[PDB]
Structure 1
Amino acid sequence: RRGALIVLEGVDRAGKSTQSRKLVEALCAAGHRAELLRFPERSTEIGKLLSSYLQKKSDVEDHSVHLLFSANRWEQVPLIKEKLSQGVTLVVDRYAFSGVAFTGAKENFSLDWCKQPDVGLPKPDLVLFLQLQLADAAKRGAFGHERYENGAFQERALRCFHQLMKDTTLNWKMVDASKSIEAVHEDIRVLSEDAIATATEKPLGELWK
C-alpha cells in the first residue's frame, strides 16, 4: 500500500516550511508513516553548490544552476521511490514547480525548456499551492537576503506558477494561506488525508510525461 507524494508550493512567506513541518507531525500523530523532504536539499555535494548560490556566496550560470536544481531532485529519486513503496507518505517543501517558476522568471527562459530536466520525476499525488496577498505576506516580516528575494522577481515567478497550474495532468489544490497557522494547517491536513487514502490506489506516476 504505497505512500502518497505530497508537494507544498506557494508564494514567499506563504508558509510552505511551516505547513510542511506541521503536516508531517499531524500525519504521524494520526498513525501514518510520513516524512519530510525539501528542495533544494542542501546537504549533498550538489546541494552545497546550490546553497552557496542562493546565499550570493557564489555566482552560477543560469542554465547550469537550473540543471543543478533538477539534478538535486533526481539524486533523491531512488530514496523517494523506496520510501513510497514501503508505505511512507512524503511531504515535500518545494519541488520541480519551484524549479520551473524561478528559472522561468528570468529573461529568455521558456517554460518548456525549464521543464525538461524534471520530466520523468516521481509525479506528486497532490500539489498544494499556498496563496497569499503581498499586503498579507509583507506583514510576515521582511524579505530575506537570499537570491530571488525581491518583489519584482517573486511576481514573475508567480506568473510562471499560474502557467503551471493550467496543467490538468496534476492534482493542484489551492490553499488560502492568509489564515492563521492552525487554520491553514487544518485545510492542508484534510486535503492530505484524502490524497493518502485515494490518490494512492493508482501507481506512482511520472511528471510531465
Structure 2
Amino acid sequence: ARRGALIVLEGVDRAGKSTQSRKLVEALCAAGHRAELLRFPERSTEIGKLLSSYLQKKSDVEDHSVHLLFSANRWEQVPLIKEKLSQGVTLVVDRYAFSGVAFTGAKENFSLDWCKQPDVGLPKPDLVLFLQLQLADAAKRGAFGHERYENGAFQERALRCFHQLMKDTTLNWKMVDASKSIEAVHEDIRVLSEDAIATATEKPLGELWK
C-alpha cells in the first residue's frame, strides 16, 4: 500500500514558508491526494509551550537546553509522522531539523556537528524545498517582530548555516525562487511536490543524517 511523501519547507524568515505550506496542502487535497500540514516548533505540547515562551522572550532558556527541546519537539511527533506516511498521507512540514541546526548553529561556539546529532535518525524528508529570497526584499515583507532571532545579523548567520546543510547530497534539496508572486511560487512548489509524491515514494522512508 503506497506510502505518503514527507515534504519539508525551509527558508529564512519571511520567505513564505507558512503561506506556501498551507497552499500546498490545499492544492494537493483538491487534486485528490491525502495530505496534511505539520509545523515545527509544534507549540501545543508541553515542550512546545516551553519553546513558545522562549521565542516570545517571555522566558530565557540555556542555549544547549533549548536546542535539545527543539529536537525533542520533533521526536515526540515521530510516531504520528510514521503512522500517517504509512497510511498513504503525504505530510507537508513548515520547518524541520534544518531550521533546528541553522538557528542554534548561528550562535557562537555551536558546531554544526553538535547541532545535528539530536536529530540524527528522524524520518528523512523525501523533498526539502528551500525558499530563497534576498534577505533584503524579505525585509520588504513588512518588518521584524519582537520575537527571538528576528534581526538581520542573526538571520544572516542562520542563512550561512543553511547553505552548509545544502552541501549534504544525501538529501533531495530543491531551491525555490521565493521572490515571485505567492501564486507563482506556489505553482513551482506544487509541481515539485507532485513529482516527489509519485517518485520519491518508491523507496522506503529514510533516516536523517545516518
TM-score of the alignment, normalized to the shorter chain, above 0.5: yes
Q: Secondary structure at the match of 1:174?
A: strand
Q: How many angstroms does 1:138 deviate by?
A: 1.3
* Secondary structure in 2 matching 1:175: strand
> Residue deviations 1:9-62, cap 9 Å, x none?
002100000000000000000000000000000000000000000000000000
Separation of aligned partners in 2, 1:46 and 1:11? 23
SS in structure 2 at match of 1:146: coil
Structure 1: distance between partners of 2:129 and 2:135: 19
1:134-154 CA-to-partner distances (Å, cap 9, x unmatched) read: 231111000111000000000
Tell me the secondary structure at the aligned position of residue 14 of structure 1.
coil
Which residue of structure 2 lines up, in the alignment, with residue 157 of structure 1? 158
Q: TM-score scaled to structure 2, two decimals?
A: 0.99
CA distance in 2, matches of 1:145, 1:200: 40
CA distance in structure 1 between the partners assigned to 2:189 and 2:28 by the alignment: 11
Range 100-109 or range 130-139, more displaced: 130-139
Cα distance, 1:6 vs structure 2 = 0.1
Distance 1:145 1:6 in 2: 29
SS in 2 for 1:83: helix
Distance 1:65 1:2 in 2: 33
> Unpaired segments of 5 or more residues in structure 1?
none
Which deviates the most, 157-166 or 135-144? 135-144
**Residue 130 of structure 1: SS of its match in structure 2?**
strand
Deviations 1:111-145 (A, max 9, x none): 00000000000000000000001231111000111
Cα distance in structure 1, aligned partners of 2:88 and 2:191: 19
Q: Does 1:83 align with 2:74?
A: no
Aligned to 1:92: 93
- Structure 1 runs (4+) deviating above 3 angstroms are none
> CA separation in 1, counterparts of 2:97 and 2:181?
27
Partner SS state of residue 207, structure 2 = coil
CA distance in 2, matches of 1:133, 1:111: 23
Q: Does 1:141 align with 2:142?
A: yes
The CA deviation string for residues 81-112 of structure 1, in whole angstroms up to 9 with x for no partner, is 00000000000000000000000000000000
Q: Which moved more, 1:136-145 or 1:113-122?
A: 136-145
Question: Among the aligned pairs, what percent are the same residue?
Answer: 100
Cα distance in 1 for partners of 2:151, 2:4 equals 36
Mapped partners of 2:40, 2:28: distance in 1: 20
CA RMSD of superposed structures (Å): 0.4
User: How far, CA to CA, are the matches of 1:138 and 1:119 in structure 2?
Assistant: 33
Partner of 1:119: 120
User: Matched residues in 1 for 2:54 and 2:13: separation?
Assistant: 18
Q: Distance in 1 between matches of 2:139 and 2:112?
A: 28
Q: Distance in 2 between matches of 1:163 and 1:10?
A: 13
